[PDB]
Design an enzyme around this catalytic site. Sequence first.
Site, mmCIF file in Angstrom:
data_model
loop_
_atom_site.group_PDB
_atom_site.id
_atom_site.type_symbol
_atom_site.label_atom_id
_atom_site.label_comp_id
_atom_site.label_asym_id
_atom_site.label_seq_id
_atom_site.Cartn_x
_atom_site.Cartn_y
_atom_site.Cartn_z
ATOM 1 N N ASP A 1 0.784 -1.212 0.000
ATOM 2 C CA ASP A 1 0.000 0.000 0.000
ATOM 3 C C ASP A 1 0.828 1.281 0.000
ATOM 4 O OD1 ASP A 1 -2.328 1.494 -0.100
ATOM 5 O OD2 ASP A 1 -3.027 0.850 1.864
ATOM 6 N N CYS B 1 -7.950 -1.977 -5.238
ATOM 7 C CA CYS B 1 -6.960 -2.094 -4.173
ATOM 8 C C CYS B 1 -7.687 -1.847 -2.864
ATOM 9 C CB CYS B 1 -5.793 -1.179 -4.396
ATOM 10 S SG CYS B 1 -6.206 0.462 -4.964
ATOM 11 N N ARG C 1 -2.776 1.865 -6.241
ATOM 12 C CA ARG C 1 -2.369 0.642 -6.971
ATOM 13 C C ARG C 1 -3.254 0.380 -8.219
ATOM 14 N NH1 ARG C 1 -1.711 -2.835 -1.536
ATOM 15 N NH2 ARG C 1 -3.338 -1.438 -0.909
ATOM 16 N N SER C 2 -4.596 0.524 -8.022
ATOM 17 C CA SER C 2 -5.504 0.335 -9.189
ATOM 18 C C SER C 2 -5.253 1.325 -10.331
ATOM 19 C CB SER C 2 -6.946 0.535 -8.817
ATOM 20 O OG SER C 2 -7.375 -0.413 -7.816
ATOM 21 N N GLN D 1 -1.299 7.329 -6.361
ATOM 22 C CA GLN D 1 -1.352 8.060 -5.084
ATOM 23 C C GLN D 1 -0.041 8.654 -4.611
ATOM 24 O OE1 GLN D 1 -3.830 8.526 -2.236
ATOM 25 N NE2 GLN D 1 -4.630 9.293 -4.193
HETATM 26 O O1 LIG Z 1 -4.956 0.637 -1.834
HETATM 27 C C1 LIG Z 1 -4.426 1.591 -2.323
HETATM 28 O O2 LIG Z 1 -3.479 1.413 -3.223
HETATM 29 C C2 LIG Z 1 -4.887 3.081 -2.074
HETATM 30 O O3 LIG Z 1 -4.960 3.896 -2.996
HETATM 31 N N1 LIG Z 1 -5.268 3.348 -0.808
HETATM 32 C C3 LIG Z 1 -5.647 4.513 -0.222
HETATM 33 C C4 LIG Z 1 -5.957 5.658 -0.962
HETATM 34 C C5 LIG Z 1 -6.482 6.755 -0.284
HETATM 35 C C6 LIG Z 1 -6.738 6.688 1.100
HETATM 36 I I1 LIG Z 1 -7.709 8.269 2.079
HETATM 37 C C7 LIG Z 1 -6.380 5.570 1.843
HETATM 38 C C8 LIG Z 1 -5.814 4.496 1.171
HETATM 39 C C9 LIG Z 1 -5.442 3.287 1.955
HETATM 40 O O4 LIG Z 1 -5.367 2.192 1.485
HETATM 41 O O5 LIG Z 1 -5.291 3.469 3.269
#
Ligand SMILES: O=C(O)C(=O)Nc1ccc(I)cc1C(=O)O
EC number: 3.1.3.48
Length: 297
Positions: free
Chosen positions: A180, A214, A220-221, A261
């Site tokens: 993550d 994800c 990730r998606s 992200q």
């Molecule tokens: O799973 C991911 O790749 C992802 O984009 N996650 C996230 C994106 C935004 C936020 I707010 C929280 C998460 C998380 O998993 O805590």
Amino acid sequence: EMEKEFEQIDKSGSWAAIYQDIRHEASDFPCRVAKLPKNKNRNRYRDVSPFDHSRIKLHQEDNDYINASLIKMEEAQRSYILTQGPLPNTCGHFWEMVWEQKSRGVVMLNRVMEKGSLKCAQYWPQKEEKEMIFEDTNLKLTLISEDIKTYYTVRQLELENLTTQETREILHFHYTTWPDFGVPESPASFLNFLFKVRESGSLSPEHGPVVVHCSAGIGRSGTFCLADTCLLLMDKRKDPSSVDIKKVLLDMRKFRMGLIQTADQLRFSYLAVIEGAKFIMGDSSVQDQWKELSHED
Ligand SMILES: O=C(O)C(=O)Nc1ccc(I)cc1C(=O)O
């Protein structure tokens, strides 16, 4: 060429700034239904919502909301559904959507447990004898078989519409070593997994769109889908120099917020597309090189 843009960005240490620029240019559309009071418990994360215009509607009368978006890439001619990791109350909704949208494949890029927390519900059966039934959406789900590799598992699932007893096969591709807010171990391992998905037929236009998730359905998606769609684009014209990765990412963020992200996931997206270009541009032998490099057995 994106390889010249890569070495340029790298030399000047400017990934974070390129990435902030994307963040600033990205689309802002309303998500009013995501935010209705009734939907509070259908969303995993406060700050991650589908836009109203591209959200997937469940074909039900009580409440049609799920946290999921349709990413429609018109030029490339590929769609994906991106969604969050199902919540304990939204697993039947998730399977409802796979059924209604006529998806063949589910690409999971997270673990159930990551960084000490539960990132996602266990929404599929882990064993053959123990099926899942989702009483709210009237669906049964059975594990038919799995193929466990080192860093990923492929499963075949049977989804039955209990209202009709129509039955469907769903393939589940589970990447288990992508952290993550992190990146795959290598372009080769990522590309090997992407090509496993592609080979399966799941991405094909005779099917509904692949569901990709994800934990939030964005980081990730978005990375997965960017690399896929950039390679598809290059394929149709055999013209890599015509693919603008930041621009295709911005096209994608019209349909869901926050795709990709981190700046390192962006940088990784370029690495995977530059490497993948080898295959698109005629060197089919790279595919087996990635498999070997990936150590999947
Ligand atoms: O799973 C991911 O790749 C992802 O984009 N996650 C996230 C994106 C935004 C936020 I707010 C929280 C998460 C998380 O998993 O805590």
